């Protein structure tokens, strides 16, 4: 009775630190299948196997170029195969999954995937097909706003330094139609959306370092008690920076509020600003509720295992870690019932 | 102490008349697994299990059309897994084997396969991988020629009647490279090859009923004493028809000669024509040597337990049956040696 997690993300197979945070919570070390194709996207842990959804492309790079179809387009993807093989793994049956090697852009011969305890499917289209969506036990959508997507390319993406800003936004133009038509709509099916926006604390900041990030959590979901702050259901702003907790400019600002998201009820926890000192993280964790921690400080402790990770100092790393614990709480209850259900 | 037989044929899993005749020699009756899956291709007998090699397909039927690669192509098959489960079966450890459902054309959930006394793997690629080739205690290749493959599509294959002659000949072409590249070279590794050609007794015959059939048998193989006619090693043409054995047209013609086949020494036994009367089969068996029969007429009696089978009146049925006995003789000496060794 293996558990399947969806993660809709745009950062490309292999460049998601969200995936690496979930992995550290779930198991030990995700390493490619020992021996075999060095271009394989699959990552295997003691508990978890991450599958890249590019592997189910129905069109290679030259293929897609021939049809002038992007990788965002459902035409370029085989959802029948994805659906059948996620189904088989969830029911304990191995699959021959084709490998999409990114260095050559060809659809490579398949690899034998063994059912794990936790299966995470990650890529552009995890929740696009209703049949695949019904197999997911939890659904995540990482929503990067266009404004920090562009900032991160300027401030961090070393490989696009060769391109000017005029052609980098002209790269975003020709990708937006396919993205908004086929990628963005998947948010409505996620149990947890993490939305990364520019910061409102310092005016006109476009650097992508200080971030306003929203954690949107679906209500009414079995085994998922959303995080809350002080008074669940209420609308709160909370600035912990004060006399007993000094912060540098511009500090930490929190918002907790209910909301309606795609005609679904959600509750939203927000963080704007970034942690100066570790005291601020510990103070923040000590005042949040329904974190699904097993001991005191696990959120902070789980983050300190990856102090080098991008976003370890703002709500991005804070909420991605919290999400991992919530999923762990869910699959513990989910396999607690299936253990007794034989 | 399990025996592994290789059977290379492109007629398709579940279409092998050759396989039916072998199981009748080897065991009681080959049935599908009890319960299991209605589309399972494994066949089970008291002595033998037949494993279709489509079950080790790595690419879906729908994926095969997506990547533009045929089923003859190794990229569409997982030989690592196939070698594992045959190495596992020969070494007597049971295995969960996947199922290729030809109806949906989908890679189905697996079925449990217990190590049998005799294990046969049949399909397009039993001798393709040297690893797998080293597990086989005997190797068979059924070489249907392109002129008989074509006639059979016309005269018998009812599903082809929707297609035109030009379309069928243009379909055979589009399959030939992968067959030339991946299937046909497996002939060199076979201990026994059966080759089906258009008959030479009727000029310009293209109907696939009267056939020239060659049984190619490797020499120097341990526990395999090839069939011979009258005088082993010599070059003989023998027409049994005469005063004492009246035949109908075009009659029977036998050829027996040594040959070199892929730089291996072989003996070749040939039959052209078809038995029009039952007396001729008995006459032919009475005059053949090294048949590995347990009693007089076992070749003929074994055939009559499948009178309906195609090729039951020509060299196709005669040689496929004789091949079964030769393997039975081989695995008994082969079992006796390792049964002796284990005590």
UniProtKB/Swiss-Prot annotation, chain B:
Classification via InterPro entries: P-loop_NTPase, PRK, PRK/URK
EC number from the UniProt entry: 2.7.1.19
GO biological process: reductive pentose-phosphate cycle; response to cold
Major localization class: plastid
Pathway this chain belongs to: Carbohydrate biosynthesis; Calvin cycle
Enzyme class: transferase
Entry keyword set: ATP-binding, Calvin cycle, Chloroplast, Disulfide bond, Kinase, Nucleotide-binding, Photosynthesis, Plastid, Transferase, Transit peptide
Cystine crosslinks: 13-52
Statement: the UniProt record of this protein carries the keyword Cell membrane: no
Annotated catalysed reactions: D-ribulose 5-phosphate + ATP = D-ribulose 1,5-bisphosphate + ADP + H(+)
Activity regulation behaviour: Light regulated via thioredoxin by reversible oxidation/reduction of sulfhydryl/disulfide groups.
GO molecular function: ATP binding; disordered domain specific binding; phosphoribulokinase activity; protein homodimerization activity
A GO term from the CC aspect: chloroplast envelope
The keyword Disulfide bond is annotated on this UniProt entry: yes
Localisation: Plastid, Chloroplast
Segments passing through the bilayer: none
Family: Belongs to the phosphoribulokinase family.
UniProt protein name: Phosphoribulokinase, chloroplastic
């Amino acid at each position: 009775e293996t558990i399947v997690i969806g993660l809709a993300a745009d950062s490309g197979c292999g460049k998601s630190t969200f995936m690496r945070r979930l992995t550290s919570v779930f198991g030990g070390a995700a390493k490619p299948p020992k021996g075999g194709n060095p271009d394989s996207n699959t990552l295997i842990s003691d508990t978890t196997t991450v599958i890249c959804l590019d592997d189910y492309h129905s069109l290679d790079r030259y293929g897609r170029k021939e049809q002038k179809v992007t990788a965002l387009d459902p035409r370029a993807n085989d959802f029948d195969l994805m659906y059948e093989q996620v189904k088989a793994l969830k029911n304990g049956i191995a699959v021959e999954k084709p490998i999409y090697n990114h260095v050559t852009g060809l659809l490579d011969p398949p690899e034998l995937i063994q059912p794990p305890k936790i299966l995470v499917i990650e890529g552009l289209h995890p929740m696009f097909d209703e049949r695949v969506r019904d197999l997911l036990d939890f659904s995540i959508y990482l929503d990067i706003s266009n404004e920090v997507k562009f900032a991160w390319k300027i401030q961090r993406d070393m490989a696009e330094r060769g391109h000017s800003l005029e052609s980098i936004k002209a790269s975003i133009e020709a990708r937006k139609p396919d993205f908004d038509a086929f990628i963005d709509p998947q948010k409505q099916y996620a149990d947890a959306v993490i939305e990364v926006l520019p910061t409102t604390l310092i005016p006109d900041d476009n650097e992508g370092k200080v971030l306003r990030v929203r954690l949107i959590m679906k209500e009414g979901v079995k085994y998922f008690s959303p995080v809350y702050l002080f008074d669940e259901g209420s609308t709160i702003s909370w600035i912990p920076c004060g006399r007993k907790l000094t912060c540098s400019y511009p500090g930490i600002k929190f918002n907790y509020e209910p909301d309606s998201y795609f005609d679904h009820e959600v509750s939203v926890l927000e963080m704007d600003g970034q942690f100066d000192r570790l005291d601020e993280l510990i103070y923040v964790e000590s005042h949040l509720s329904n974190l699904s921690t097993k001991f005191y400080g696990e959120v902070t402790q789980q983050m300190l295992k990856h102090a080098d990770f991008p976003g370890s100092n703002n709500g991005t790393g804070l909420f991605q870690t919290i999400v991992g614990l919530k999923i762990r709480d869910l699959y513990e209850q989910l396999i607690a019932n299936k253990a007794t259900a034989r």
